[PDB]
Nucleic acid binder design. Structure first.
Ligand code: MG
Ligand code: MG
Ligand code: MG
Ligand code: MG
Ligand code: MG
Ligand code: MG
Ligand code: MG
Ligand code: MG
Ligand code: MG
Ligand code: MG
Ligand code: MG
Ligand code: MG
Ligand code: MG
Ligand code: MG
Ligand code: MG
Ligand code: MG
Ligand code: MG
Ligand code: MG
Ligand code: MG
Ligand code: MG
Ligand code: MG
Ligand code: MG
Ligand code: MG
Ligand code: MG
Ligand code: MG
Ligand code: MG
Ligand code: MG
Ligand code: MG
Ligand code: MG
Ligand code: MG
Ligand code: MG
Ligand code: MG
Ligand code: MG
Ligand code: MG
Ligand code: MG
Ligand code: MG
Ligand code: MG
Ligand code: MG
Ligand code: MG
Ligand code: MG
Ligand code: MG
Ligand code: MG
Ligand code: MG
Ligand code: MG
Ligand code: MG
Ligand code: MG
Ligand code: MG
Ligand code: MG
Ligand code: MG
Ligand code: MG
Ligand code: MG
Ligand code: MG
Ligand code: MG
Ligand code: MG
Ligand code: MG
Ligand code: MG
Ligand code: MG
Ligand code: MG
Ligand code: MG
Ligand code: MG
Ligand code: MG
Ligand code: MG
Ligand code: MG
Ligand code: MG
Ligand code: MG
Ligand code: MG
Ligand code: MG
Ligand code: MG
Ligand code: MG
Ligand code: MG
Ligand code: MG
Ligand code: MG
Ligand code: MG
Ligand code: MG
Ligand code: MG
Ligand code: MG
Ligand code: MG
Ligand code: MG
Ligand code: MG
Ligand code: MG
Ligand code: MG
Ligand code: MG
Ligand code: MG
Ligand code: MG
Ligand code: MG
Ligand code: MG
Ligand code: MG
Ligand code: MG
Ligand code: MG
Ligand code: MG
Ligand code: MG
Ligand code: MG
Ligand code: MG
Ligand code: MG
Ligand code: MG
Ligand code: MG
Ligand code: MG
Ligand code: MG
Ligand code: MG
Ligand code: MG
Ligand code: MG
Ligand code: MG
Ligand code: MG
Ligand code: MG
Ligand code: MG
Ligand code: MG
Ligand code: MG
Ligand code: MG
Ligand code: MG
Ligand code: MG
Ligand code: MG
Ligand code: MG
Ligand code: MG
Ligand code: MG
Ligand code: MG
Ligand code: MG
Ligand code: MG
Ligand code: MG
Ligand code: MG
Ligand code: MG
Ligand code: MG
Ligand code: MG
Ligand code: MG
Ligand code: MG
Ligand code: MG
Ligand code: MG
Ligand code: MG
Ligand code: MG
Ligand code: MG
Ligand code: MG
Ligand code: MG
Ligand code: MG
Ligand code: MG
Ligand code: MG
Ligand code: MG
Ligand code: MG
Length: 68
RNA sequence: CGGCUACCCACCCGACCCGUCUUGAAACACGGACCAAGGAGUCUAACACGUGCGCGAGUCGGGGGCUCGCACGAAAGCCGCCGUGGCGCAAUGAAGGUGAAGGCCGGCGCGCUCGCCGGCCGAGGUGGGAUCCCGAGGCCUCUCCAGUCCGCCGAGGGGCACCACCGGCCCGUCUCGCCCGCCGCGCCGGGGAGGUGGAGCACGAGCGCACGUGUUAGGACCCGAAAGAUGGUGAACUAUGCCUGGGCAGGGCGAAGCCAGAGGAAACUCUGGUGGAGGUCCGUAGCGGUCCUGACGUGCAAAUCGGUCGUCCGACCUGGGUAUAGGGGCGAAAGACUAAUCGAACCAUCUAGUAGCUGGUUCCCUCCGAAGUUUCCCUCAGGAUAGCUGGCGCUCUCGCCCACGCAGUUUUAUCCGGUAAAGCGAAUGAUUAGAGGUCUUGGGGCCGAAACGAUCUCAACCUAUUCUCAAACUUUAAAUGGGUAAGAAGCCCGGCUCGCUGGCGUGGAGCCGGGGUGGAAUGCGAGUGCCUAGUGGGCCACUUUUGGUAAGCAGAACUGGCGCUGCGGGAUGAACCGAACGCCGGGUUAAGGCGCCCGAUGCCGACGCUCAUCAGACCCCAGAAAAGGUGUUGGUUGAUAUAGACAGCAGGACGGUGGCCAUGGAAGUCGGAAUCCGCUAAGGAGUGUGUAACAACUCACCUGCCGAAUCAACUAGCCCUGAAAAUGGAUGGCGCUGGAGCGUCGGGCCCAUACCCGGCCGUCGCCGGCCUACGCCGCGACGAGUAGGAGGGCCGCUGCGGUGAGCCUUGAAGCCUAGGGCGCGGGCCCGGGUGGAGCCGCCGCAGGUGCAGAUCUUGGUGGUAGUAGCAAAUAUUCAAACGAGAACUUUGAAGGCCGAAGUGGAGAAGGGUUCCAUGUGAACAGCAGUUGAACAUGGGUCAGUCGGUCCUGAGAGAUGGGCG
RNA sequence: GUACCCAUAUCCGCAGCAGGUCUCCAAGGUGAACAGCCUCUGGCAUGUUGGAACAAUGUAGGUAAGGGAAGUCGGCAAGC
RNA sequence: CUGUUUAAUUAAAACAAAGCAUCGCGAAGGCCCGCGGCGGGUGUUGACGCGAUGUGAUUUCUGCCCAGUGCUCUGAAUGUCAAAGUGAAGAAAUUCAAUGAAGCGCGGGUAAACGGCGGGAGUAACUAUGACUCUCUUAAGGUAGCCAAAUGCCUCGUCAUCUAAUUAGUGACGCGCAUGAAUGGAUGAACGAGAUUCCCACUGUCCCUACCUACUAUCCAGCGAAACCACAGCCAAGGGAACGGGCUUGGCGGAAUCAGCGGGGAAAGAAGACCCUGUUGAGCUUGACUCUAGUCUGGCACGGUGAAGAGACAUGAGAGG
RNA sequence: CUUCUGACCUUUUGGGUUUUAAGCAGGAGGUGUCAGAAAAGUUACCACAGGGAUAACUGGCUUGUGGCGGCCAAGCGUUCAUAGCGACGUCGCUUUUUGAUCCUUCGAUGUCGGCUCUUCCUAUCAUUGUGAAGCAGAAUUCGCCAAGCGUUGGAUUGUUCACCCACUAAUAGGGAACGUGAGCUGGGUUUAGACCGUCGUGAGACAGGUUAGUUUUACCCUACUGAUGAUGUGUUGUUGCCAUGGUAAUCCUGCUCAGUACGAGAGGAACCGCAGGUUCAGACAUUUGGUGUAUGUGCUUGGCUGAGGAGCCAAUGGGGCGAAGCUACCAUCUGUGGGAUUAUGACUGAACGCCUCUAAGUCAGAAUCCCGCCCAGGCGGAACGAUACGGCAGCGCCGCGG
C-alpha cells in the first residue's frame, strides 16, 4: 500500500494565514550567553555606583544648574 | 368581483436517487418494497479551563448532635469551647535539615574588592504604561474691577495592572579564603564573597456551590465477532465392546472321505459314480449406493425417487438391555461419528468479553470556518506532537506644523549564491583530424665485414592550431530570489562606578543630568493570554524537473483550483476560460456566441485562400507522422531571348578513329584510366533504345518555318495521396461551398448569482436618546461553504414549583380537511367534520426529548398475482336413495388394482381416547362434502392357568474399609 | 395393563410428507424357485381436485431406411 | 483376494487383512487409566502370553553406509555437576574450600531405527564411445532389479508395431533434473461398480433428423403462495468512477394483454471459501520462548537391633626430604 | 537492574558501636527493528472484522514486445536499383500476443476449452470486373473498387496453439466483458480422499505428474418470436395502393469450341452454347423410405370367463404387414433483371504553339449500391354494397326558422 512520502504543498498558505511576523523586539533584550567575567564586572560596577554617584553627580548637577 | 395557497390540468426553461467510505458517486459500489410505533453522546468519580454567586487570608458542616410525634418534614433551622478535618496561607533537598525586607543620611576602625553604630519611613531601579494632578495660552453686549458665567490645551509630575531587563532574599550544589560563640572549646555550631539548579519570596487570593466545554476509568454513543474460563445435559441418530433374541428363495463349480471296474510282473495308474467343503460363483428378501454426473433442485424429501448396480452362510443384517461423555468417548483411520451442529457438542453464567475494523447516529436560523503537512512510536487502515480552526476574553490606539505599530509589496544602500547560459587554442575527466620539430624508444628500406658512420618512412613524444561534450567539471556568470537598515529604543555634551583590560584619566560596559522628532513610497488599527474540535488516504493544472519507450504511471519545487463551490460559456464534464453565491427590479459586461435547434449579424460588412469519389470548422478536448503532387495560390536565388529563344514541324548530326588496357565477342553504347585534334554552320573519343558484335533508331549540338517571352531549382498557405477494425453514428445535430470553412479585421447585438443604481432581511463597526435600557432609533461595509466551533429560538415533547379569580359535558385530549392566515425557517393560530373528559399560555427547574436509512427491532400492508402450483405408484362408469345443495357420502351393477415378500389378517416400541353410537356443518380435510382420525354429548378395556410381579446375564450399586 | 392405529392417514421427520421404524400366518397357474406375470380368500379408489384440447419445450417409454462410433476428453447413454 | 471407508459432492490405487520382521516385560514386572489410596484395564492373564511399531498374497531376492540425529551398554581410571552434609575465616549474617547422585561429555553396538548412497583425468591398429588405471572428499558412492512408468523439466525423447493420419497405447533403448530394494524392489494365477489402449457384433452418439404413446405444460371450475422490489424499464455516440436505463446530442415514442424465449437488468441465492491488512483467533508440528503432569536420581523422617571391614578428622610417639 | 569510583557525607525507624543494605554525583555492562518486547513454521480442514488503500477476469491510458505498412536506395535479381525483394537508417497503425500502472469491481460481475447460433470488421484465400511481370499458353507473383457469397471431413491432445491424412474454386486472419455455464458439457485448472518424485527433523509445500470429486432459480421488466387487440374514418363488409422494414442466391464439373489459338517441342486455353452437379432458400407428399394405438387385420406366450365361439388382463404383452395424416438431399418441383456508377480502359480537348481520359464536357463498365421479383402492411389514404318496423318508433337528404 504505497502512499505519498513527503510534500510541502499548501504550507505557505497555512503560515501566512496566521502570519510570519518578526519576533518581538524590546529594549534590554537579555544578558544570557554574555561573558561571565564581563557580567561580573557589570554587576560590580552597578552595585558600586551609588557609593560615589549620589554626591559627585549631585554636586555636578548643582554646578550645571548654576551655569544654566 | 378578489384570493396566495397543501386541489387538478398545460405549455416554456432547468432538472440523473437519497445516506455514507472516498481525490473522485446517479453510477455496472454498498442499504432502502411501503407504512405505524421504539431507537443511539447518558450517569458516576477525578482533572483542566472559563463563567455566575457568597465569604475572604480565610473558606467549607457534605460527618455527627440539638429543638416537638407529624401530610408537605428522607425538607428546612441551629451547633460556636463540635473546624477533628480538606484546600490555601512556604518553599527547597534523596535525607539528616534549612527555610525569604529593602532604601536614605552621618560617623569610626587603612568608609579597605571594609564591618558596626544611631535616626526614619518601610518591598528597589530603568524604559513603556489606561487613569489622575499641575499647567503657559487664548475662547462669553459699549469699559480698568471680580468671584460662577464660554471653555479646550502645549509642556511637566506622581504613576494601577501588565510587559522586558538589572539588582535583592530562601533552599540544594562547586571555588576562595577569614571571623564569631560555648550547658562545655570537639573530624562542635553559626556567618561571607562569587557560578549555577528549584514547580520559590520579593504586601498574599483562595475556598464552597452551580453551569459549559475538553480528556480519562467505568459495558460508556449504539449494533457486531473467530476465541477463553466455570458448572451441568446428552450413546432415542451415529462409532465401538458385552449380554440376550430374530433372519437369510432358488441354481452353478465340485474339497476330503467311500464303493466299483479296467490296465500292470510289481510299484502304482486310469475310468464311471457316491459324497457335499468353501471367508466359492449367478441371483431373491435384507444390507450399501457405481453410473446415467438422469428427475426434483422455493422438491415427496434441511439428501428423495426411476433404471442401472456390489454383496447375499457371512469379517453377515438387525431388535432390546448395557459400558465408555467433550481436549473426553469411539474410530478395519474418511480428523469420519458423538441427537439435522464436530479440525473440539449442547445448555446457562463471566458477558453489554475486545476490536487501531464496517454500518448508523433524530429540530431551525445566524456567524466563523480547515487538513491530508514536520517529528516520534513493531510505526504504514492508528496515536502523540507541531501546524491549520473556533470560542472566551484581556491591554492599548483614532475619533478636534503631527501619531505607536504592522506588511506574502515596491524604492534607496548593502552583502549572500554557482542555477540558466557559456568555456575547455583555461584546471580535471572524455574527444576527431591535419601541420612542423624529431632528444629518445619500437617496426620497415638503403650505402656495407657489423657499427648513436650516414640516410628515407611509420609508430611514440613535444609545439602552435582544429571538430564535438560533462547532474556528481569549471575561468567568468544572468534573471528570479535570501538577509539587514531607512531614527527619539537615535545622535551630539558633561559627570560618576568597575573587583573587566591596562604605559597613560587607556579602552569598554553601566548609571545620572539639561538642551534640540518633519527623516523612502503605498496601504492598514495593533499586541497578548487560556481552552480547543476536526485533520493526520488527497487529486489536478502553466512552468522547472527524477525513474520509465510511454501511460488518465510513480515520485518532487512555487502558485492556483477541486475536495470545502454554486453560476455563464467548452453540446456532454472535477481540475479549462470568466467569475465566486442573501431575496428582488433596471442598465452594462467578462469568457463565449449571432443559419435553425437557441437570445443575438435579417450588417445592400471588407481583403484574400480553398473544391475533397475520406473537405474543414476553436487551449485542455478526444486523433496522426516521415515522404510526394505539371491542383491552385504567393516568395527567393538563378540561367536564356529581336545578334529572333522556349515548345512544335522539317534538315544535318561528319574525319583522324573498328583510337589506347581487355578478348568469346565491345566498331560512340557490359568495364578502368581518360577526353584531344582539322574543314565547318554543328556534331560531344558520344545522353539513351537495340545487335553475341556490325548495322539501324535517337540525343547533346547547329540550322530552316512560326514568332515573343520562357526555362530550371528551392521555399510555405489551402487541398490531395500517404490514412486499415470490428452494434449504426457523430464539427453536438440538421445541414453549409458569392460560406453556416480557413487567415486578418470593422460597426452592431445576445446574457452570469460579475459590475453600477434602488428596496427588503441578517451580521459587524461606529454610535444616537433620561423609552421592556435585555427596549427604541441613524449611517456605512459586508452575506457561499463539507469536517468542525460558537450564539439565538415567542420551534417542539414529558414531568415538577409559582402564576394566568386560565379554558372545558352549551363539549377536553386526539384524528381528518380543494377553508382563512402568520413566521425565511423549525412550527403555530383560527374555521369546519368526527370525537367524549381533560388540557394549555407565562416565569424557572429536570429529562429515558425531535428519525429516512443502521442486510435497524416489533406489527401491519402492496407489485409480483388470481401467477407458479394442486402430474411418483395403469381407472373409472351407470342407476337409485337420504339431502336445499352430489363426481368425491351410501347401496346395487359393470370394468380394474394390490395377488399371500399384499393396498390382507395380528402384534412389540411409540401415540393416549384417536375405538363406538348419536347430532350440527363457520374453523380445520390444501376443491367440495350429507363424509372424516374435526367439533359437542354419551359409552367402552372384567384374568389363579395372557404378561409384569420371581430368577440371574453383560452391568449398575450401599454398608465394612480407604480417599477426599 | 387389557379399547384402538401398529400405517404411502392414529409413531418420528413443524403435516393425511414417494423418507425411516422390530416380528407371525402365508394359496392356484406358468416357471428351478418366496424371480416376473395372471387369478382366488381379504382390502382399495389410483394416493391433498375434475372438465376440454393434444402447440412448442420438458419428464419417462419404443422404433427408424444406407453407413456403424466417422459425435464426444472418453462406446456417456443406448444397443447386442 | 472376501471385507471397511468420508450419513448429506469421492467406494478408490485409500483403510483393513493372513503372512513377514523388530522392540519391552519372569509380576516389588511391561504398556496405560486415575485428583486421591500399594486405587484400576490387560488379568478367570504368565513368553506358543501381553503391550508397542513397520511392511503388506506365493516365489526369488532384503546391496553398501553408525559420520549426524535417535536407542542401548560399561569401569566412582576420567571433565562438568543441585539440594543436603563437612572443614576453615569472621562477633554473626556471610564468604571460601574439600568431596560430589542422575544427567551431559567420552568409548562400543545397533539401519526389516529415522535416514543417505559424489565429483575429475589418461587409456581399443578408422575415429569416437569406451575393457583398464591414478586421484580429492566424507560414513559409504545406487549393487541385484525397473522405467520416459501414477515417478522424465528439456519432451509431442529415439527406434519398431498399431492408423489413410496419432501429443494416445504396447515393446525396446537408458550418467535416470528427481527410480530402487520391509521408505520395500522385481514378478504375479483368480478378483476388482478401480484408470487406460485396440479389435469383433451391436445400435439415432452422429451423418440428419422425423414420427408415436402416457404425465404435464395449455383454457376453464374451485383453492391458491414465494424469491425479489430506491423510483422503474426502447437504442446509437460523447463525457463520466475509464462498459448508462435516467445526463448531452441524435434515432424516436399510443392502452391492456397471452404462449415461448433466455441477450440484458454488470438478475437472485451468501458482509469473497481466492489475494492482502489485523500488533484478530483456532487446528497441527518442531533442535522457536516460558512452564507442567509424569518419569530417573540425591537428601531429610517414618526406620529398629548385631558382627566384621574400608576411607578421613583430633590425640602422643618412632622413621623420611 | 548490576558493577566501579568520591565524601574521613545522608538514612538504616526506642537510644548507641560495627558488618550489611538503601541514598547523592559520574564511568561502564544494552536495546543495529539503532527515541530502546523477551518470540519458529504450516494450514489445500481453516474461521472472524475489513480492503477494490491491495493481486488472479474484463474494460480504460501508452505500445516496449508481437503483428501490419510507408520513405531513402547500398545491393540481389545472367545485363539492368525499384517485374519481385531490398540491408545500413528512419517514420506510422493495431489492441487478434505478452508486458507496464492499479482507475471501477472484495455485503461475489460464476474465472479454460469444446458444442449451437447471430452480427460486424478487411490487413482478400477463392469467386465478379481490372493494371503490372523476368505474363508465348497453362500454372503463378505484386496491387486496385471490392465483405455480397463460401472458407470443410478426421487421427492424438482438456487443450488456445501445433502437426499429419484426404477432399476442395479456397480450406485466410479476427471482434462482440479474450461473444456465448439462470444454453450445455466438467475433459483440465482450482477445496476436502489418496498415490509417486523433490524439498523440510516435522506438520506440510511444489505454474511437478496421475485418479474420484453436488453445475441452483425466471412466474417479474425489457429485447426477440408468434396471437388477440387499440387509436381515426358515423357502423359494418368486400375489393385494393404502399410509405416503411427485411431481402437469395453462390460455386463447380463434363461436351462442341479444340488437341484449336499460343508454343520449336513438351504442353496447352478463352467467348457464345448444351447437360448437369455442391451449398443455401421456399414448399410437397403421386411415387420410394420412416412413424404408427384407426389399438385395421391375421398369428403367438402366461393367466382368466366351465368348454367351443367370442374375448379380456400382463403400466400401448411381444412380434409380421398396414389406411389416413406428419416426415426425409432418404423421394419430388422451383430459385428470375434494370439503373446510376467504383476500379479501369477510352472520346473531344486547353491550361502549357505540342502532348494529355479532365480543367469544363462525353463513352463502356462489374459477385459491390439502390430498386425490380418476394415477405408484413401506418395514429396512411382511397372505390363500392347495406345502412336498423312493428304497434307507438328510429335514422338519412333538402329548405328551415329558435
Ligand atoms: Mg500519508
Ligand atoms: Mg441520516
Ligand atoms: Mg475505510
Ligand atoms: Mg479507490
Ligand atoms: Mg452518493
Ligand atoms: Mg448504489
Ligand atoms: Mg456488487
Ligand atoms: Mg437491495
Ligand atoms: Mg418515533
Ligand atoms: Mg486543624
Ligand atoms: Mg458482544
Ligand atoms: Mg488466550
Ligand atoms: Mg466440563
Ligand atoms: Mg443404541
Ligand atoms: Mg459368497
Ligand atoms: Mg467368474
Ligand atoms: Mg440386489
Ligand atoms: Mg440411489
Ligand atoms: Mg444412501
Ligand atoms: Mg464414482
Ligand atoms: Mg444429478
Ligand atoms: Mg425444474
Ligand atoms: Mg444386482
Ligand atoms: Mg458381477
Ligand atoms: Mg455373489
Ligand atoms: Mg480446552
Ligand atoms: Mg450430526
Ligand atoms: Mg473449548
Ligand atoms: Mg456496546
Ligand atoms: Mg502514518
Ligand atoms: Mg488561533
Ligand atoms: Mg548545486
Ligand atoms: Mg549547462
Ligand atoms: Mg497511486
Ligand atoms: Mg503524480
Ligand atoms: Mg474528504
Ligand atoms: Mg477554501
Ligand atoms: Mg470553484
Ligand atoms: Mg456550464
Ligand atoms: Mg489564465
Ligand atoms: Mg479563471
Ligand atoms: Mg439583473
Ligand atoms: Mg466576446
Ligand atoms: Mg433566434
Ligand atoms: Mg487529410
Ligand atoms: Mg467539446
Ligand atoms: Mg476520453
Ligand atoms: Mg505546395
Ligand atoms: Mg455529417
Ligand atoms: Mg456581493
Ligand atoms: Mg455563510
Ligand atoms: Mg408550548
Ligand atoms: Mg358529541
Ligand atoms: Mg369514560
Ligand atoms: Mg432517546
Ligand atoms: Mg420510520
Ligand atoms: Mg432491513
Ligand atoms: Mg397487535
Ligand atoms: Mg404479499
Ligand atoms: Mg394456471
Ligand atoms: Mg404427489
Ligand atoms: Mg331429493
Ligand atoms: Mg360406490
Ligand atoms: Mg383383473
Ligand atoms: Mg416369509
Ligand atoms: Mg405386510
Ligand atoms: Mg356429523
Ligand atoms: Mg377443504
Ligand atoms: Mg372413529
Ligand atoms: Mg374430539
Ligand atoms: Mg374362569
Ligand atoms: Mg405368569
Ligand atoms: Mg460406589
Ligand atoms: Mg466410611
Ligand atoms: Mg387388542
Ligand atoms: Mg408416509
Ligand atoms: Mg415407506
Ligand atoms: Mg405357485
Ligand atoms: Mg410344473
Ligand atoms: Mg380421484
Ligand atoms: Mg395420502
Ligand atoms: Mg438406423
Ligand atoms: Mg436398418
Ligand atoms: Mg457392422
Ligand atoms: Mg473403428
Ligand atoms: Mg482425447
Ligand atoms: Mg452404460
Ligand atoms: Mg467401521
Ligand atoms: Mg459416490
Ligand atoms: Mg499391572
Ligand atoms: Mg508378501
Ligand atoms: Mg535394506
Ligand atoms: Mg557409534
Ligand atoms: Mg550446608
Ligand atoms: Mg583414437
Ligand atoms: Mg544402475
Ligand atoms: Mg512393466
Ligand atoms: Mg485412438
Ligand atoms: Mg532418491
Ligand atoms: Mg537417483
Ligand atoms: Mg432392435
Ligand atoms: Mg446506450
Ligand atoms: Mg466499452
Ligand atoms: Mg457510455
Ligand atoms: Mg442500471
Ligand atoms: Mg429526463
Ligand atoms: Mg445535468
Ligand atoms: Mg408475458
Ligand atoms: Mg426459461
Ligand atoms: Mg467482506
Ligand atoms: Mg500496525
Ligand atoms: Mg480449528
Ligand atoms: Mg526508530
Ligand atoms: Mg500458529
Ligand atoms: Mg486430511
Ligand atoms: Mg484501486
Ligand atoms: Mg486490475
Ligand atoms: Mg451474482
Ligand atoms: Mg451476470
Ligand atoms: Mg456476409
Ligand atoms: Mg469470455
Ligand atoms: Mg478431473
Ligand atoms: Mg484434491
Ligand atoms: Mg501438339
Ligand atoms: Mg506455334
Ligand atoms: Mg430448407
Ligand atoms: Mg408415403
Ligand atoms: Mg411405408
Ligand atoms: Mg399390430
Ligand atoms: Mg392364450
Ligand atoms: Mg377359443
Ligand atoms: Mg402390476
Ligand atoms: Mg406393438
Ligand atoms: Mg413396418
Ligand atoms: Mg428443404
Ligand atoms: Mg475516370
Amino acid at each position: 500500500a504505497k502512499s505519498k512520502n513527503h510534500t510541502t504543498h499548501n504550507q505557505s498558505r497555512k503560515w501566512h494565514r496566521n502570519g510570519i511576523k518578526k519576533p518581538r523586539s524590546q529594549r534590554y533584550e537579555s544578558l544570557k550567553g554574555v561573558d561571565p567575567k564581563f557580567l561580573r564586572n557589570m554587576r560590580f560596577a552597578k552595585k558600586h555606583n551609588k557609593k560615589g554617584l549620589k554626591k559627585m553627580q549631585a554636586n555636578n548637577a548643582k554646578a550645571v544648574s548654576a551655569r544654566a
